[PDB]
């Protein structure tokens, strides 16, 4: 007794309503956005890359890295559903399973441990936990992971900033602001290292 | 086979809704704004040019450099469609192609390779790659190219500032901030060389 067609449409329209929530919480969008935010503030440029471009890059990146799970949903939950092979209730479960598996690969056991105790449910295996518990654990792990990557990328720009300030202080021109002179070198290092292609490749490879 | 009048209208309104995205992700708007962002940051003025006029000049600059491609879209796609020479499906493809060609002229081979492997698809010719994968490669190349131009624009202003600081220190006045003295010199040398006209030539002509 699968859900009637009227209820099936009502469920799907509700999922489209929560589409921003699914992208910003259940996907890779948050980690990429935060790492780009740290990198932008690491250099002297405040909002030169602009917010729309940063989100635009992240949206394409989060679509590419989640193409495997997106295809797995299609090949196991959409095509059997359209070919009249699985109950609509079964197809919904078949779509949710790869999404849960992907979120578990990028989560930390400490995050699961605190939220499982917070929910107060007696579950032992770290695979049959509810989405209500998994999603906050996943987004918490993504924020912490983004900070680690953000600190990693920040260090070389801190090195340049300290060197420029030290060299200027060596000549006794303490009045000269190190930030104005440091910025072209920060652009210099990031461009001869091929930073933009490098960071997006690492962010793509990070989700594994 | 061809889309009905009702459906074609729906597609037209949809592209108008995404019009800001097409400007800042497919056209030359991103490179111009980033380069102009460096120019404002290089000089001692922080918000003095203000954000409004920079975007407005960038929009007019884009319409100038996109005029060949926009006219090519007009001739190849709009004119047969208005005269009812071709169907809506092929007219849409005839409009998409000039945009794809322009994005290929402003991208790099390495950037395309990274994203085509990232998408996990099969292709052998760059000319028939999907626009969904070309867009992230296009802007990534645009950001790297803009940083290169901005770095070159930042050097002469750094040159002027370092000279003024050295002169003041050499004269013995270790108490005066170089920024106040250097700012008129940076502005004077920006005007008597007609700096913006030179930047227009190296920015508008950089696409070709």
């Amino acid at each position: 007794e699968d859900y009637s067609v009227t209820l099936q449409i009502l469920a799907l329209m509700t999922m489209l309503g929560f589409l921003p929530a699914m992208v910003i919480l259940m996907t890779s969008f948050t980690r990429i956005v935060v790492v780009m935010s740290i990198l932008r503030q690491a250099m002297g440029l405040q909002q030169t890359p602009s917010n729309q471009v940063i989100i635009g890059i992240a949206l394409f990146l989060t679509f590419f890295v989640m193409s495997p799970v997106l295809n797995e949903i299609n090949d196991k939950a959409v095509q059997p559903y359209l070919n009249e092979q699985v109950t609509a209730r079964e197809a919904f479960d078949a779509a949710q399973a790869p999404m849960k598996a992907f979120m578990l690969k990028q989560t930390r056991i400490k995050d699961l441990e605190t939220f499982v105790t917070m929910s107060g449910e007696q579950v032992d295996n770290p695979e049959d936990v509810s989405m209500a518990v998994l999603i906050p654990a996943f987004i918490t792990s993504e924020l912490k992971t983004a900070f680690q990557i953000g600190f990693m990328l920040f260090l070389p720009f801190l090195i340049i900033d300290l060197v420029v300030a030290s060299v200027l202080m060596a000549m006794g021109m303490m009045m000269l602001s190190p930030m104005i002179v440091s910025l072209p070198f920060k652009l210099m290092l990031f461009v001869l290292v091929d930073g933009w292609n490098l960071i997006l490749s690492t962010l793509a490879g990070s989700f594994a | 086979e061809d889309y009905s009048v009702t459906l074609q209208i729906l597609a037209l309104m949809t592209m108008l809704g995404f019009l800001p995205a097409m400007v800042i992700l497919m056209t030359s708007f991103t490179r111009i704004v980033v380069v102009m962002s460096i120019l404002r940051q290089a000089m001692g003025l922080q918000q003095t040019p203000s954000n409004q006029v920079i975007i407005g000049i960038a929009l007019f600059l884009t319409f100038f450099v996109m005029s060949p491609v926009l006219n090519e879209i007009n001739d190849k796609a709009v004119q047969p469609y208005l005269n009812e020479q071709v169907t809506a499906r092929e007219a849409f493809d005839a409009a998409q192609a000039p945009m794809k060609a322009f994005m290929l002229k402003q991208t790099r081979i390495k950037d395309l390779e990274t994203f085509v492997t990232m998408s996990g698809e099969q292709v052998d010719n760059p000319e028939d790659v999907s626009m969904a994968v070309l867009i992230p490669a296009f802007i990534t190349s645009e950001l790297k190219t803009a940083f290169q131009i901005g770095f070159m624009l930042f050097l002469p202003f750094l040159i002027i500032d370092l000279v003024v600081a050295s002169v003041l220190m050499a004269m013995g006045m270790m108490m005066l901030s170089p920024m106040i003295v250097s700012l008129p010199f940076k502005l004077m040398l920006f005007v008597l060389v007609d700096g913006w006209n030179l930047i227009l030539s190296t920015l508008a002509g950089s696409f070709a």
Binding site: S67, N71, N74, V78 | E1, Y3, S4, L7
Partner: peptide
């Protein structure tokens, strides 16, 4: 695949509109 999902949906709507007209 998933990309063709949108294409198939639009074609069905176009076919339904074409038959209705």
């Amino acid at each position: 695949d998933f990309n063709d999902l949108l294409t198939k949906a639009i074609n069905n709507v176009n076919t339904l509109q074409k038959a209705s007209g």
